[PDB]
Amino acid sequence: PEYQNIFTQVQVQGPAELGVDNENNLTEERTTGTGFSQLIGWIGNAQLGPIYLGWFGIISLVTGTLWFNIVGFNMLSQVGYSIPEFIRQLFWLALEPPSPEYGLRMPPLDDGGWFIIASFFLLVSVISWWLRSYQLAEMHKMGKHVAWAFAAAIWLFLVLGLFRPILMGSWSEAVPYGIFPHLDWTTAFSIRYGNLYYNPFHALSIVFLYGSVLLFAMHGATILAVTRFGGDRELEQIYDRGTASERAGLFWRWTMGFNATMEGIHRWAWWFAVLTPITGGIGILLTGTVVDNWFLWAVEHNFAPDYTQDYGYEAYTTYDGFLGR
Amino acid sequence: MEETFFGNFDLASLSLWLFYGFFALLIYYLQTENMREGYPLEDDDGNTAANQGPFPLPKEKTFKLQHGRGELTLPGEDVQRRDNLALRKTAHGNGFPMEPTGDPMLDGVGPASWSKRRDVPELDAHGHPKIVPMSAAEGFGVSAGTDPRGLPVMAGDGEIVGLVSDMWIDEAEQLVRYLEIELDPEWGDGKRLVQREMVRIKSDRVKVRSIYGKHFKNVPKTKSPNQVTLLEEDKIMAYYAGGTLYADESRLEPQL
Amino acid sequence: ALLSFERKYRVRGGTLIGGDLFDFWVGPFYVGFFGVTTAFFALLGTILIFWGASQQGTFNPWLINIAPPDLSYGLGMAPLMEGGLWQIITICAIGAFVSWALREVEICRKLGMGYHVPFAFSVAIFAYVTLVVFRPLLMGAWGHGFPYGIWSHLDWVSNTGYAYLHFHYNPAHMIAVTFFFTTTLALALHGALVLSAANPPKGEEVKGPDNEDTFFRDFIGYSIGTLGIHRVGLLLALNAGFWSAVCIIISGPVWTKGWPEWWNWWLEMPIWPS
Amino acid sequence: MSKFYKIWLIFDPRRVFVAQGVFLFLLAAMIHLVLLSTEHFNWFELAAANA
Amino acid sequence: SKFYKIWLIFDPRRVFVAQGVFLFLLAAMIHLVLLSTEHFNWFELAAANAA
Amino acid sequence: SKFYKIWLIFDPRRVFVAQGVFLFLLAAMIHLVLLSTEHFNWFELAAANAA
Amino acid sequence: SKFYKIWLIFDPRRVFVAQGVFLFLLAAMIHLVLLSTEHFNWFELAAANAA
Amino acid sequence: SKFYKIWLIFDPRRVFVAQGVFLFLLAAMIHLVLLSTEHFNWFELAAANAA
Amino acid sequence: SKFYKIWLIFDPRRVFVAQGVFLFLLAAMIHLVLLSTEHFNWFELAAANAA
Amino acid sequence: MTCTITCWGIGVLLGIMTTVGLMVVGWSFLQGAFMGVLAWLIVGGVLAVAVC
Amino acid sequence: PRGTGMSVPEFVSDLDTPDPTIEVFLASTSDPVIPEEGAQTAGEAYENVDP
Amino acid sequence: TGLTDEQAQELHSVYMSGLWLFSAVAVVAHLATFIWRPWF
Amino acid sequence: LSFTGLTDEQAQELHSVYMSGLWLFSAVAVVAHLATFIWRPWF
Amino acid sequence: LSFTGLTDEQAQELHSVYMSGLWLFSAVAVVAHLATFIWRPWF
Numbered sequence A: 001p002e003y004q005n006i007f008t009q010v011q012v013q014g015p016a017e018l019g020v021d022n023e024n025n026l027t028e029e030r031t032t033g034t035g036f037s038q039l040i041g042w043i044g045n046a047q048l049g050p051i052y053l054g055w056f057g058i059i060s061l062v063t064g065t066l067w068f069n070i071v072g073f074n075m076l077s078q079v080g081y082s083i084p085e086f087i088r089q090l091f092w093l094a095l096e097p098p099s100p101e102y103g104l105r106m107p108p109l110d111d112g113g114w115f116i117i118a119s120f121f122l123l124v125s126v127i128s129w130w131l132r133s134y135q136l137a138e139m140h141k142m143g144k145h146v147a148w149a150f151a152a153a154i155w156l157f158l159v160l161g162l163f164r165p166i167l168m169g170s171w172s173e174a175v176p177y178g179i180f181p182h183l184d185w186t187t188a189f190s191i192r193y194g195n196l197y198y199n200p201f202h203a204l205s206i207v208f209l210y211g212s213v214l215l216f217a218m219h220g221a222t223i224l225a226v227t228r229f230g231g232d233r234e235l236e237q238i239y240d241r242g243t244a245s246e247r248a249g250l251f252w253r254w255t256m257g258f259n260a261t262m263e264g265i266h267r268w269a270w271w272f273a274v275l276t277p278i279t280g281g282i283g284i285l286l287t288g289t290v291v292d293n294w295f296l297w298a299v300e301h302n303f304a305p306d307y308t309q310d311y312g313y314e315a316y317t318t319y320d321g322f323l324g325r
Numbered sequence B: 001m002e003e004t005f006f007g008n009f010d011l012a013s014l015s016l017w018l019f020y021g022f023f024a025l026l027i028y029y030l031q032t033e034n035m036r037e038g039y040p041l042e043d044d045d046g047n048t049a050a051n052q053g054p055f056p057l058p059k060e061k062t063f064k065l066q067h068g069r070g071e072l073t074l075p076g077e078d079v080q081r082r083d084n085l086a087l088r089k090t091a092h093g094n095g096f097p098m099e100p101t102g103d104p105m106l107d108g109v110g111p112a113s114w115s116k117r118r119d120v121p122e123l124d125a126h127g128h129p130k131i132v133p134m135s136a137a138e139g140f141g142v143s144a145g146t147d148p149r150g151l152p153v154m155a156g157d158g159e160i161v162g163l164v165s166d167m168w169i170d171e172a173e174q175l176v177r178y179l180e181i182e183l184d185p186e187w188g189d190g191k192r193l194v195q196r197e198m199v200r201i202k203s204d205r206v207k208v209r210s211i212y213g214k215h216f217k218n219v220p221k222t223k224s225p226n227q228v229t230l231l232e233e234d235k236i237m238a239y240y241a242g243g244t245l246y247a248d249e250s251r252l253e254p255q256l
Numbered sequence C: 001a002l003l004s005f006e007r008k009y010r011v012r013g014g015t016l017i018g019g020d021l022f023d024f025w026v027g028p029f030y031v032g033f034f035g036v037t038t039a040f041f042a043l044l045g046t047i048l049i050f051w052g053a054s055q056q057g058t059f060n061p062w063l064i065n066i067a068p069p070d071l072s073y074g075l076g077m078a079p080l081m082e083g084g085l086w087q088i089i090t091i092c093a094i095g096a097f098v099s100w101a102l103r104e105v106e107i108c109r110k111l112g113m114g115y116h117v118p119f120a121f122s123v124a125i126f127a128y129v130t131l132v133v134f135r136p137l138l139m140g141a142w143g144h145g146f147p148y149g150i151w152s153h154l155d156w157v158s159n160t161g162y163a164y165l166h167f168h169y170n171p172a173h174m175i176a177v178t179f180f181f182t183t184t185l186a187l188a189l190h191g192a193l194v195l196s197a198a199n200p201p202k203g204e205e206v207k208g209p210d211n212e213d214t215f216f217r218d219f220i221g222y223s224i225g226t227l228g229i230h231r232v233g234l235l236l237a238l239n240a241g242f243w244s245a246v247c248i249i250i251s252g253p254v255w256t257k258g259w260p261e262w263w264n265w266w267l268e269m270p271i272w273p274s
Numbered sequence D: 001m002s003k004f005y006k007i008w009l010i011f012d013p014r015r016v017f018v019a020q021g022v023f024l025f026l027l028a029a030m031i032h033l034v035l036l037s038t039e040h041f042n043w044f045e046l047a048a049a050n051a
Numbered sequence E, F, G, H, I: 001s002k003f004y005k006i007w008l009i010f011d012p013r014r015v016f017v018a019q020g021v022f023l024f025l026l027a028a029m030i031h032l033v034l035l036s037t038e039h040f041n042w043f044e045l046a047a048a049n050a051a
Numbered sequence J: 001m002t003c004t005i006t007c008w009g010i011g012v013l014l015g016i017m018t019t020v021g022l023m024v025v026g027w028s029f030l031q032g033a034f035m036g037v038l039a040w041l042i043v044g045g046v047l048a049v050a051v052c
Numbered sequence K: 001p002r003g004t005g006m007s008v009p010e011f012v013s014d015l016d017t018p019d020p021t022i023e024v025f026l027a028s029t030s031d032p033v034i035p036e037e038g039a040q041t042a043g044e045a046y047e048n049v050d051p
Numbered sequence L: 001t002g003l004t005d006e007q008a009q010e011l012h013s014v015y016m017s018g019l020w021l022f023s024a025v026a027v028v029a030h031l032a033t034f035i036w037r038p039w040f
Numbered sequence M, N: 001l002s003f004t005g006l007t008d009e010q011a012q013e014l015h016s017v018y019m020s021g022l023w024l025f026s027a028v029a030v031v032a033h034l035a036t037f038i039w040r041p042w043f
Ligand code: BCL
Pocket: A126, A153, A154, A156, A157, A160, A185, A186, A187, A189, A190, A195, A196, A197, A201, A202, A205, A206, A207, A209, A276, A277, A278, A279, A280, A281, A282, A283, A284, C157, C181, C184
């Protein structure tokens, strides 16, 4: 069949691209160490180029390791320094938040005290990385959309572990640092406060989460469909619209009655992704601090469905009938 | 706070309606930002359409193009408009397909239609043209996959229309863009470019299925063999895609 | 109406079936043979929903609920108001979705572009198909499909999730969820790069592909490129749709116990000391 | 032993000093954390237990 | 014997950092293995001896 | 005998790195399977003795 | 007899690596198979033999 | 006796690699099938014979 | 029966590989269904004959 | 390529062989599959790099 | 209710397999013996019988 | 890119020779199986 | 005649070695099967 | 002849050193295994 531009069928490698520069002198803090991976080059660019290491980057990397190490050292000490048991229970162990009896006060180190310290380094690490994104955009003389989009993700990150626990008056409302435990927290959070499905902002966040994957499947497929017209070079299609932007627009205009531009697609792309944690952060912030039960909130506001059929299994079958005896 | 402002309208309900107002404003903002190109609507006859849509045109935004290419305000007269199109209306009304008046691939209409872009090469950060042949590119070479240079080129009908003499690369992104085809004298005269996205590279040959053997002699050429302008780029790429419908009557006619 | 550049693209041909009998445009929409069937199936399905809503007693969009039949009916047809209307709407919905995907094939064939979008939509159709017919077929009853309600179909997700005692422990759910949170990650950053490059601070020149290529090189040490992000981007979202289809088709037809119990293979491996 | 000064020919003093400093602090913090996790060498708990 | 030729093949800079991380990780791992055993946990034994 | 020609095929630096990684991993694996068995676990045997 | 011509087809560097990987994995797999059995597990026999 | 022309069609490098992979996989598969059966399982037979 | 005219329209590389795979898959399938039956399973039958 | 894919194909075949091999000697399908997945990634990855 | 998703999936093979201890109880239970008027009790027939 | 008349003449002869050789063993195997354990 | 570049005489020489290798592999397989049949027959 | 661009004389020099290291590594292993067998025999 026709070549679907999914994997590049021939790779060319030249001198490593060290990056652009201006009076801000980016090259001072760049590593100047490049490597080329032909495996990742099949789907994307093959150069593992140099990384700009500043002070926001180093502080974020160092403090993030401290949070990673403090969590890891606790988890290792939780199983009595048994490496085989630490690996076996790696997905089950965590650094549990403080007990609710301590409120917002500093708890003992074994009862969430190390959680606050590890959370303190994680908070510094995440904010420092955001500052790096803001500083890099300013030093690259581009817009701060990367930093602004990151701040939306941090908004849910801050609400989950910093803002809501403060508003709820207890550090116990934070999310445990575990693979399965933050899944258990996710399930327990929904159960504790009614049914988080009936949270309108959780529903709203799902709309933009579904829309984000829906759009970025649509945008990815549309660009790859028009990549035969140089559609992957979107920036040149913004300053000088080619047939790639015209056919991409006309495909969606003829399909659903309206379309976007090569630049306006990313505004839809940016805002749907950004609205996913923004609505989620609001929904989590309103959970417990305001509502404490969402299904009853749905019943009160008359959007919880009502069922007339019976509930027991005896109303539909028999135990012997199900067993086939 | 667990108190309702009125009836059952609490802080959670207030935030929901605040987002409804913001989203309605955002939808209006997003849709107008999508209308910087292509509007006013116009109709089949070319006159401005009576209907223009619920959303008004946005205020002009200005792009400061690099490499001394001037400014750019998207809401306005479109320099990419094509004139003297070789089409005729199949109906006196609106909403009906146009019938090409000649060779659709030669005239550049439909799937073969291009856009009147700038007649200058795309430039990278340094300033020199972005897409250059590997012969001109310094330090570049094949690192993975099959090298298409020297392999014969097979058309959509199985004809061998020449062999790949060189391939053009985007040295800024280290990506292959085109393949030069040294057209055989029985089929063509000189060198033609084919985009990498419409050619499938096999072990012993490169196959392009959109264009038959007899259509390579009419592929648009480049003014210079060292660079390709955005206009030549748009004409070359559109020609191959136009062959997906215009190579033979079977492709244009319904498959069932 | 048209666009400022639409006229040169509205050419005859590119249909899969029906030729020029349906080959015309109604407004901006393209009407094909599958645009005719889309109109029939979508309108019939939508009307039957409101017909079922009328007899249900409420027209509230939140409270509208067209539920599948009982599990006792098996794979056979049920009375139209005992779950049979859901079966017809499902047939109309499947016919509308397939026609919509096939209509997109005609549109992108007429524009001489790739068929990536109809293929990507087919994954979304497959995710719906595996939810409404494939999984009910494997489980032996049409009552296992989700109901057609804005909030009623959330109760089905909640009950089906807790039908395996903790649905987060589903290994395919973990893979599928990881793709959603990353697809939105890729969408946020990819949309940010193009916007940041095309909209620099006021009074400064716009940037080219190199500036965004070197930004995440300076940011995260690697940039996948302008073309690569759309290639990985389609794959990330398609895998999100595919693995979501997998996580629900193995919940009940392939796995009946709790999903935490699935991870017992890892816990009691012979290598782990007692 | 007396000729160990040649290690600075192999190693860049700038990056090794940074690596040594980060490792030395992480070692010091880790060992203190290990001591705090024990029931006998938690000097904070012993102070409370002694009063 | 005459094992000095290993540095003709191995880069001294790359091996020295490679063995530096390996030695500490091995030393840390073996120390942790001792801490996982009741008999060889010197921290828990001090508590028992003091009592 | 004549096995010295293996280095005309194998890159000495590419094999020595592979041999070093393989030998340690092989040594670690056998030490691990010994600890898995109750008879050859010298840490548990020491615990059993003098107790 | 004249099997030496297999090297005209197989690259000696390619086959040697593949053979080396195959032989160790085959040896490791067979060793692990014997440990799985309750009769040829020499580790468990020594525990039983020592009473 | 005219079967030698099969090599004019198939590249010896491709078929030999495929044959070697297939032959071992087939041999391993048959060996595993016997080990599944209770009769042709020489590992369990030795245990039964010794007892 | 000559029937050599069919080979003119066929690529020998493609048909031979497809037929070779098809024959083995067919042979394996018939061998698998025979083992599924309790009468023609020669592995289970051999156990019954011995006992 | 023509060699990395073959090495990848060799690894997945060995992963299936190790999957059924563990089931025969006991274990479980899921436990055996993980080692087969591990064998496919490790042996396939090592071969894809060691031999090219 | 239909459409709510409230259902319990179970394999028919699992459904067709009853509790393995059901027949064990059936093989150990027995019908009660109806006592007659003034029948002998276990307290007087045997010794050290709890009340 | 296609076969000549002469090329397919020898190819078919070899293929038939392989056909008879493969079938001859199969016929012998089926007869041996039928004697050992008939299915009719 | 050829598809992979080998000449007619080259394939004849290659086939002779391949058959000799095939017979050697089949010879030990026959011996291996014969020994197994004596140890534990399946007929 | 030499896929690594390494001379025959160099290869013999490299192997002689490598074998000397191999025997030294094996000599320690023999002593190590002898000590383990005395402490806890596995036969
Ligand atoms: C039983 C389970 C409950 C449930 C309980 C919750 C809870 C609890 C929450 C959600 C939330 C979310 N739910 Mg819900 N949810 C359920 C059912 C669903 C279903 C479904 C089909 O059934 C879906 C699709 C969703 C979907 C979603 C998303 C819309 C939303 C998360 C937003 C976001 O992007 O997060 C992504 C954001 C983050 C991951 C945090 C930001 C991370 C920071 C910025 C990154 C730091 C990185 C860190 C330093 C590590 C770096 C390491 C690197 C290697 C270096 N839920 C049911 C009802 N749901 C969230 C919400 O409410 O949003 C309003 C939330 O808190």
